[PDB]
A paper describes a structure:
Inosine 5′-monophosphate dehydrogenase (IMPDH) is a promising target for the treatment of Cryptosporidium infections. IMPDH is a homotetramer with square-planar symmetry. The reduced cofactor dissociates from the enzyme and the mobile active-site flap (residues 302–330) folds into the cofactor site, positioning the catalytic Arg315 to activate water for the hydrolysis of E-XMP* to yield the product xanthosine 5′-monophosphate (XMP).
Here, the structure of C. parvum IMPDH (CpIMPDH) in complex with inosine 5′-monophosphate (IMP) and P131, an inhibitor with in vivo anticryptosporidial activity, is reported. P131 contains two aromatic groups, one of which interacts with the hypoxanthine ring of IMP, while the second interacts with the aromatic ring of a tyrosine in the adjacent subunit. The electron density indicates that Cys219 has oxidized to the sulfenic acid, as often occurs with reactive cysteine residues. The amine also interacts with water molecules to create a hydrogen-bonding network that extends to the 2′-OH of IMP, the sulfenic acid of Cys219, Ala165 N, Gly212 O, Gly214 N, Thr221 OG, Asp252 O and Tyr358 OH′. The right-side aromatic ring binds in the adenosine subsite formed by residues Ser22′, Val24′-Leu25′-Pro26′, Ser164-Ala165-His166, Ser354′ and Gly357′-Tyr358′. This subsite is highly divergent, accounting for the selectivity of the CpIMPDH inhibitors. In subunits A, C and D, the NO2 group is roughly parallel to the aromatic ring and forms water-mediated hydrogen bonds to Ser22 O′, Val24 O′, Ser164 OG, His166 O, Ser169 O and Asn171 N and ND2. The water-mediated hydrogen-bonding networks of both the left-side alkylamine and the right-side NO2 group offer many opportunities for further inhibitor optimization.
Residue numbers in the entry:
A (entry chain A), B (entry chain D), D (entry chain B): 1 to 92, 135 to 310, 325 to 378, 388 to 392
C (entry chain C): 0 to 92, 135 to 309, 326 to 378, 388 to 392
Amino acid sequence: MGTKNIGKGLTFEDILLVPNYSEVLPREVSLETKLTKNVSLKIPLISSAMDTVTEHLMAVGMARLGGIGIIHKNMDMESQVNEVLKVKNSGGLRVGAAIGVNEIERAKLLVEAGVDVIVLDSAHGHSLNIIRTLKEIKSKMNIDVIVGNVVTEEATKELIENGADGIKVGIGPGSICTTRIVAGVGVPQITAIEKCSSVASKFGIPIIADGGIRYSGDIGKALAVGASSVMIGSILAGTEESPGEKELIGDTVYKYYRGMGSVGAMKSKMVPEGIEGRVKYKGEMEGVVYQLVGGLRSCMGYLGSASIEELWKKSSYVEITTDVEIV
Amino acid sequence: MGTKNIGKGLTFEDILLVPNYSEVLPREVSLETKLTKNVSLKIPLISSAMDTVTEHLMAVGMARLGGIGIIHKNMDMESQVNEVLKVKNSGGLRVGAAIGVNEIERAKLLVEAGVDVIVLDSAHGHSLNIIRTLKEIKSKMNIDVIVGNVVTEEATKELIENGADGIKVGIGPGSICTTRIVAGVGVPQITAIEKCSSVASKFGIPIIADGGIRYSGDIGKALAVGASSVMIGSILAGTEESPGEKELIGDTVYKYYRGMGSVGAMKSKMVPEGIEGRVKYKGEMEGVVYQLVGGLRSCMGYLGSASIEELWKKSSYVEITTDVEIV
Amino acid sequence: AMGTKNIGKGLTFEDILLVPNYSEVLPREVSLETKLTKNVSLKIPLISSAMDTVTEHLMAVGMARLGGIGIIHKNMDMESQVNEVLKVKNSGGLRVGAAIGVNEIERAKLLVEAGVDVIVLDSAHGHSLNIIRTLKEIKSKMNIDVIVGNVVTEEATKELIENGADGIKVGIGPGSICTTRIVAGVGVPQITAIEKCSSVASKFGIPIIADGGIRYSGDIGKALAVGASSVMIGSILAGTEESPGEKELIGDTVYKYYRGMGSVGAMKMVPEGIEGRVKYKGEMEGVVYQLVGGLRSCMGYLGSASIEELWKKSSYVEITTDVEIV
Amino acid sequence: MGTKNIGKGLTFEDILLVPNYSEVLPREVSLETKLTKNVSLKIPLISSAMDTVTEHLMAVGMARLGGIGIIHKNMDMESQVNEVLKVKNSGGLRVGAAIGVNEIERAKLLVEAGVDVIVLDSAHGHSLNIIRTLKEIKSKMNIDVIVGNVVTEEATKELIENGADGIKVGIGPGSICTTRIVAGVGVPQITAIEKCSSVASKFGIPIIADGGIRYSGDIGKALAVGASSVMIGSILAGTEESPGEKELIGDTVYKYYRGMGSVGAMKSKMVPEGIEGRVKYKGEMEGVVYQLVGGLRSCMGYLGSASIEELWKKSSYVEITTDVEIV
Ligand SMILES: C/C(=N\OCCN)c1cccc(C(C)(C)NC(=O)Nc2ccc(Cl)c([N+](=O)[O-])c2)c1
Ligand SMILES: C/C(=N\OCCN)c1cccc(C(C)(C)NC(=O)Nc2ccc(Cl)c([N+](=O)[O-])c2)c1
Ligand SMILES: C/C(=N\OCCN)c1cccc(C(C)(C)NC(=O)Nc2ccc(Cl)c([N+](=O)[O-])c2)c1
Ligand SMILES: C/C(=N\OCCN)c1cccc(C(C)(C)NC(=O)Nc2ccc(Cl)c([N+](=O)[O-])c2)c1
Ligand SMILES: O=c1[nH]cnc2c1ncn2[C@@H]1O[C@H](COP(=O)(O)O)[C@@H](O)[C@H]1O
Ligand SMILES: O=c1[nH]cnc2c1ncn2[C@@H]1O[C@H](COP(=O)(O)O)[C@@H](O)[C@H]1O
Ligand SMILES: O=c1[nH]cnc2c1ncn2[C@@H]1O[C@H](COP(=O)(O)O)[C@@H](O)[C@H]1O
Ligand SMILES: O=c1[nH]cnc2c1ncn2[C@@H]1O[C@H](COP(=O)(O)O)[C@@H](O)[C@H]1O
């Protein structure tokens, strides 16, 4: 009854994947995927380009486990290049790096330093400035470019037309995100993946599902509705390999975790669109990633899918509504 | 299922605005709007006509920042006139003043005092007494009259036909409102703005979205579905410029904030339709208004809208369902 | 809706809001006169519940004086119930009701002889053989208006009316102290239940009593708006001084006992009500004043000068379900 | 709005049963039911095959009250056989026993020991391994086999065609279940029973509703939408007859209750799909079961159903939205 009402948006919590006939065990499924149309991964996990999540140590950790880390850009170009070189000089290991609009010089140095992918990011990926930066990169240098963040078919189509090698989806869903309350803007993440994958898959362009992952189950849901990989922040921020500081709040140890659109991140008249928060310290990332990969394998076993491509073809979900004390 | 069921009603929390292709930056958008058909504002913010929110200092503050304040009527005619004169005597600043049903004498004195707009208020705007008062004002004096509060198409049409220069929308959504629980009456504010805007827009008559604003994001939502401006109470009640008293509750400083239909406000056999509450002290209104305006600019940027006219044209929304500890 | 046994969405009071109409009537001007049964009228549409923590003679005298009516509960010997009814009648000839259960023909007889104005035939499941038999037997042996409940369906409403019901009490599920939903898994949301039952009863001119679930004055307006002629109230009145419930100090607050008639204590088993406590509210007149005031406000918003007009003009909208009150 | 969306899933809390005309009292209803196509029970209650719920003492209690207990498999074959023999030597009492995939030797020993039903269970019942194990059992020995857990029509149909004598439904609903959050997989239990019973009732094959029972009212709901019986874990875990350990926490006594997919159960590199929890100690199981049976009787009385078969015929439900302090 609303003219401007385009429908009901679903987030991860709104749905559950329905089991299929299965002939494959969790241990047997292949988790190989495409990061961009020219770069592959062994597992579909990416660490977020945030200054409390990913520098060289996190990037090295991610790559060793078959994923990839995106070096954040909240540092001068020289330091970012050096972080990339740190990962690259640690054996033949893939690594990514973030840039912002009009940062062509930063992009050039990164590419020279041997980065495998450039992540061109903005709060609003479907914009004139972003597209102009994209076209400039593709014409000046030889590199795969992931562009984001977008949530619509139209955005996805236009970015692909201008040379996007990967599409990053997510406005609204981040754990430290306040765009939804500051600007009133967003799209629930399942719906956003569905819309963007509906265009991108037609062109063989990978969708990165960015933000809102809380449990391993969410990874399965994101991939099932069309994503090729997921980008993760808060979960990895609590690990020993994250660059964030530590603080003892009362009894337990916490790691700092802040949005790149927070007051503190922007200092490194403002209208912040992210908070500065704390997450519980969780130790080594390897144990953390193992559980995440373990959960996804279990999911794909339930859906009888031996690969992500198969999962796209076989998956379906149900909408759900939203006395034992756990030890 | 019920014949009397007119459908599902949405409030601000129920929806999220969808991003469009954008070639305008937040800093570049124009927030100019019409308060009434003959009075314009530089920003679409109005402070509520309540005795804990708007007297002359709040009204001056709002006017200086491009908005307007409505002097409340919980005082003798002479006192209300003097408050208006205080705003008027400090630069050529705009100001409004509230009156109730049959208060023709008060309105006359306010108009003579140079008030820019009269706000004819009632719990139930769509009524015989309100219409009569409106017609009497329009025939005895020359001034723009805003009439409210209403939530239906029929109400909006009738008030416009009888000469209303602006329509104030909102029954149910105010933070201190108990009409919904005392009378069981109301309409969720997004739905109410849509219904009323569907009639008023072709007439070129501005809709004021009154009540329920908690975050800057809500302002964007209100304007996007048809409103020309928003009226705000509780957010401004906490500022140093509001007339409410201060109380120290344990650790933090609070300001009094009460509905004009509360027992205490009606004392200044009763059946109250508002509560007497407290809100945290927030300091200078300038910083508060800065954030609100900033959030709206962010919104219009996401929606590629360089003006409010453009926002009405381009906006769409999605209906939504309703680990990190903030520092 | 995907399930073959799914008959649709059920709405309770909290699920909806009444939409304002054009109004030419003030809250003070509306008439609250209504029918209790097709032969008994009331000045206000409020009934106090037939529970042993809510209504004995003092509550029933309170209700009647204010324009409503009280239903004396049946958790007492027959002679005792008659004496309560006689206490109400001895003071101004005020109207009063009384509850009976299935097969309690002797009790109904004594009550009618005592001058009761209406008999309330009550069961957990009103649409049953035993209830129908008792109803038919009453109508044939004595001359009295009989309210029957509780029911939630069109077919229940129709059959009870065809067997002589003078009023229909609607409510399975909504009571504040009710656990039928949890114990039996049974019930219908109260807005939907009133709509279904009134759709049948309005054709025969038989009043609907909306029983249970009232928390705020606004709920009264909603119930009447969708077809009810009156509402029955328990927990709100249970905290008043006129209620027969005991009082207990818990912490720094005085509480009144309030228990379901299907609770262990009331029956003294598979209980379908809880034993609870409600905050003490003082005299009932002030409480009833607020309730009536809120309903007047509602009828003013909906431009309805009477309950009849409210039935004709009312519509509602479905809704989704940092100012700190002093 | 989503193509892979198969609809809204309902759990127990989402519905309420609608009363029918009744000519039967709660005390008059028959609770007799089929456990499998060749085994009948006096009441439709089964205790879960978990090591904190059912060993011989629980199984004897369930049998004497008219139901049945399923001896868990987290013990050696000889120990499980010994538990079965303990129940059989306590008079002619029904008893069941659980096996996993490929546990043909275990099944043979249990059958030779006089077990009345084999419960072939897996996290994902609709799989190649489960089907092969089923066909192997049916071909090598003579016993009724209950197979689970499944949530779909296709799964139900295939297991039945391959010789299942009972179908256990439930992926998602258990009180200690985290398959939902670890794998992102599940189906709300009312919907799951509906889908599976739509197939199984055509073949006269009983549906067991497994998991998520919290109140007696839930049993009525499960049977009403097509189940022949319900399996219960958490409710019975707190009884004196459960094998769980006891522990004082504060001033209240708790019993241990853990998923069989918990790390604690699998110890008796893990990716658990159940939690380790505690439930309040509730004394003898007899009083507990009495309330559940009484609740179901009350339900069938409301629905005018003198038997479960009649309940299937007459039942309907409504979908619902989801100041008195209890003593
Ligand atoms: C929200 C955000 N990042 O989010 C990542 C995707 N969820 C973020 C990161 C750093 C700074 C900021 C800040 C600077 C706080 N805010 C924005 O940039 N907001 C914004 C609003 C509308 C538009 Cl159209 C544009 N734009 O680039 O043209 C930007 C935000
Ligand atoms: C609720 C309210 N204001 O709300 C502002 C808009 N949300 C308010 C303010 C002062 C006094 C009151 C009081 C006096 C407490 N309440 C009403 O006036 N209620 C009301 C109900 C229905 C009608 Cl039909 C009429 N009417 O005069 O025609 C009035 C309420
Ligand atoms: C639930 C209830 N009253 O509710 C009033 C309306 N909500 C109540 C009052 C006293 C005792 C009880 C008790 C005795 C606790 N429970 C029932 O009577 N339950 C019940 C269930 C199904 C049927 Cl079919 C019948 N029946 O008489 O035919 C009765 C309940
Ligand atoms: C979840 C569960 N039981 O649930 C009972 C019914 N809800 C459970 C019990 C013991 C171990 C486990 C463990 C071992 C923790 N997890 C699984 O077995 N998970 C799983 C995932 C997908 C598949 Cl395709 C299969 N499989 O049948 O090969 C198994 C889980
Ligand atoms: O300040 C911000 N505001 C909104 N989103 C942000 C901000 N900073 C980072 N993000 C996004 O949030 C994601 C992480 O989401 P999380 O894993 O749910 O913590 C990142 O990959 C970014 O896309
Ligand atoms: O007592 C009352 N009851 C209901 N609404 C009120 C009352 N007093 C003021 N209002 C409305 O509530 C608005 C403020 O809502 P808020 O900004 O959400 O606090 C005012 O502009 C009035 O329209
Ligand atoms: O024990 C019980 N179980 C269920 N309903 C009850 C029980 N006792 C009283 N009731 C109902 O609950 C109504 C009161 O509801 P309340 O006003 O919401 O407290 C009564 O008028 C009865 O219809
Ligand atoms: O570890 C587990 N993960 C998920 N489900 C489990 C696990 N262990 C047992 N279950 C299921 O949960 C049921 C008990 O559900 P409850 O009665 O709601 O506690 C059992 O009968 C099993 O079907």
